[PDB]
Design a protein around this ligand. Sequence first.
Ligand code: CL
Ligand code: CL
Ligand code: CL
Ligand code: CL
Ligand code: CL
Ligand code: CL
Ligand code: CL
Ligand code: CL
Lengths: 288, 290, 289, 290
Amino acid sequence: NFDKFKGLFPAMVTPFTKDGKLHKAGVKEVVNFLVEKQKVDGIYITGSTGEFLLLSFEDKKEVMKLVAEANAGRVTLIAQIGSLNIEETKELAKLAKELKYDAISAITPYYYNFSFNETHHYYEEISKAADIPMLIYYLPVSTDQFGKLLEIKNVIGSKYGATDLFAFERLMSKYPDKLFMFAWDEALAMGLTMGAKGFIGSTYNVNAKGANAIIKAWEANDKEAVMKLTHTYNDYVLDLISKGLMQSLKAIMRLHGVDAGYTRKPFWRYEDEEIKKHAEFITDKYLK
Amino acid sequence: MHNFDKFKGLFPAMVTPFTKDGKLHKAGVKEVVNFLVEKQKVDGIYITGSTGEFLLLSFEDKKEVMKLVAEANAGRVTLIAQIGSLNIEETKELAKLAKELKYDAISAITPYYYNFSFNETHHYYEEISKAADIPMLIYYLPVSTDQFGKLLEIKNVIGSKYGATDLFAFERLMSKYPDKLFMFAWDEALAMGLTMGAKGFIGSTYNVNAKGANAIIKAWEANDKEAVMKLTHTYNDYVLDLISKGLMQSLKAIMRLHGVDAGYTRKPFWRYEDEEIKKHAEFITDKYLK
Amino acid sequence: NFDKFKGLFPAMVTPFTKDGKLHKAGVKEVVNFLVEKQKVDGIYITGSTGEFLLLSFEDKKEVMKLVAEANAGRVTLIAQIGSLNIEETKELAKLAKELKYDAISAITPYYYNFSFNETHHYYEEISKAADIPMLIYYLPQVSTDQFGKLLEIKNVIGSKYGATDLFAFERLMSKYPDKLFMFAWDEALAMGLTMGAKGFIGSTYNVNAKGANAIIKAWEANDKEAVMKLTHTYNDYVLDLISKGLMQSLKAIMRLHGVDAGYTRKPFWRYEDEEIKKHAEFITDKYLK
Amino acid sequence: MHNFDKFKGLFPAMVTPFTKDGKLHKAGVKEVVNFLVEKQKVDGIYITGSTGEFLLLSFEDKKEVMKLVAEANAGRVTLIAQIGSLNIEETKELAKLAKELKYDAISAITPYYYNFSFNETHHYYEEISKAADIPMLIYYLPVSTDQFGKLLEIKNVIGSKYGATDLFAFERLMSKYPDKLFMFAWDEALAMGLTMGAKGFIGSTYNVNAKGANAIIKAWEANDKEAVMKLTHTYNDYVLDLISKGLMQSLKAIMRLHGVDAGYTRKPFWRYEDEEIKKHAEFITDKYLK
Ligand SMILES: [Cl-]
Ligand SMILES: [Cl-]
Ligand SMILES: [Cl-]
Ligand SMILES: [Cl-]
Ligand SMILES: [Cl-]
Ligand SMILES: [Cl-]
Ligand SMILES: [Cl-]
Ligand SMILES: [Cl-]
């Protein structure tokens, strides 16, 4: 049931105007750029990289609508819809279903130290809202205890973004019928090696070509290319994040003529020249 | 040498009453304030902080809580409102409202969830400072003693709420910034804070055991060093027993047991069976609060 | 040219009698077992797994001699020779050279919080003792760059990499293609391979080199599905193995296979006879038969 | 209650003198002991611990240091010997020697390097206890308060050397085990230790600043709350300044500056240029130790 979840899913940036309003036309331009230029397999919206905590409830609903409309069914869509507002999350779940999202995800309840029982109840509540597949976020206790969340109605698997590749291996061993979307960009080839087939990541927003190169080399059994292309990709990631990640991704999109707008406060707003030069540097070095 | 008089003593981090169904329980806010001032005999109240479930409040809910507290207090004790969130524009409006309502200070949590840089954190506090002329308490951010000073020197910042378990860093801040106010926010180390010069204490546990905490302060002031030890052991036994169940649920249950319409927590905090949390409230009350 | 460093290097256990004496004959039996039964590519001696801090200076020398004698030049030999005793360490480096070990290694100065300068100076002192390749231990706390200051010390050919940080490993492999990284996290063998590790040091290969080699062969044969499956089995084995003390289990498993592998030294827990035997039979039956 | 009066006060964790070329400097051990007793005026001495470079001592060196200290001290102050290591049979011989030499207590570090289980650690202390009838101080092991009590109950164990930065765990131990002796070993938190009932202090920094540490204790006993704060800020300034170069190198240099043949550290500790470390010693001495 998971072929549509194979490949690269950029964690989409959410365009804001300079004065911090949701930039609706920009959302459409980003979706078109991801689908048409980056040639991605799917889009992961309103996650951390989408600045989701800086979005109003109305903004979230609007992004979900704009993305579904611009996509027009071309690629797989997953919406991250979690927050501490459980009623809003349920409403966004229903909206995702209505808009024909392929799946939803929800972050672990954040800020406070929520118990396992509270986390389990949270996912249970969201599950009763709409019959749409859910990816839970990986929560570092036991492999077995994590399985209790994976068994929740409508949960098809997890978005796995931890650096612990042993925990990842143990999950792949224990739950071969669950879907693990691998969310640590710098370890793409290591994820492939242990059976990941779908990848969500911020860095795929502007370098799906470089990431796809790793996947293609891996599938072709070119061991040395897998290594080389990984070192290059990870050079890129570290260069990219020498300035704010979302500001950099957005600036690179703008450099390519995409109306991707700006980050919202309290993210740092860079001087014009500084961030443009950063985007130029990254594009020249990695993105041709 | 005796600065910040109005900030001395105990400041419960006030719980925010909700109905069973999750609505802001406005009458409950007033009851809680009256219980804290009149029964707990507190020196001040710290509102819409973590213990006040502030991330579960709407913007309008926050304004309402700030108004209801100022109204119920009617100037009796010192008021501090935690007003920070990732919504900077809303935070500025709350700063202005705090000022209009004659709050004695505001505070604002460190920008959370994401890993914000020092510069982003510094800029966040700078923006909040321009909104209103009202003293600000920043949250301690563990960044050397010196680098933290760059945050302390922001316009209108008078000091910091210090909630870390690092007592050496606290001692270092007290040495380096004798002109700034440090409100000590680790309830389990009250006496340690006092030892190194803390005079004001913000904490969730003072909502229902101000007497036990004050007993430590009074012993300390009275030079009763053995009682400081004994009363601390009792107090920390209390803290550990209290948090055997969810903190805010337990605080609210103890208030409800004392006839205070303190309501319930909001989702996603665990909702206990009413009999289970009642026994917990009685357990804490009979053991420590008589 | 690091061809002789390719493959599996068990971190050899050091046999002691029940009374805590070095069991000389057992040292040779363990070497023969690793070479002939486990079919290993090399042996890594007097490391953590070999209870090296429980060995006297004279014991360390004797193990070094016994292993070189038992090996009879068959497999690659690496001796971990580090301790806080620098003069002894220097003497062990000279001995390893005299015995024609292929490399030495030395753990980071331990117990105390030593500075980078102290750690650098420690490796410099050892380096001057004897002309033999040195593998330094990876230290996290430390940038990929400043770890390069350790890697460039005289006679240092690379590092034994035992951290769980696969990104730092990838970065080292990127930056130092000239250096040798021996990958020492048994539970991530296939991940190591993926990023270019070719030599593996670990405690678990003492008794399941076959299981580990199966992963390597599947990887080399492009059987990506088997790499996954054999890894899942291998990691099941690792976790089952360490449900009792690691060295007690490895030694009990060897004893079950007729190898005079002896016992651990204090303060390691001494199990009751039946408990550890049952554990060894369980591991053998489930994974090693 | 036990009479633990001889364990009150300051116990420097004595440095072990070595010659420049790394030999045990036997005459230096006696001079350091006299300096501690006669000039620092300490209440006791804690030998062959981390600060004494014990891991860099041979078994024979350890026995020699123990003999030389007991000789030089001639019963003037309380003596405690740290005798632990991974060599259990050697540790037992050292426990027997400590008793023969009339040491007041012994201590033994937690088995180190490897991750030893609770059971292994328990059995280790059990084995040491059978060797000689002499009081033992176990090292605090960060573990529940109740689980640590199982170690405290071992034959001949009278308490623990508490060196962690966790003052809450310390408070919990003091609450649960009022008849066990806890020697407080975090120099930067002396006054916080006193406040929770510590009466005996083991620390590297008392080797050369017993005066500054005693000033804190005397101020605390005198209920001079402000002086406790001020003297603590000064003391902790001193500690941070002291360790801006290697701790043992600095302590030894300060002693040498005071005409004490304290010698040098052993490898792999950094050897400073003599002028560099001398100026460091003068800087500390002139700023803090006159
Ligand atoms: Cl994301
Ligand atoms: Cl920007
Ligand atoms: Cl709070
Ligand atoms: Cl409840
Ligand atoms: Cl090892
Ligand atoms: Cl055993
Ligand atoms: Cl010490
Ligand atoms: Cl020196």
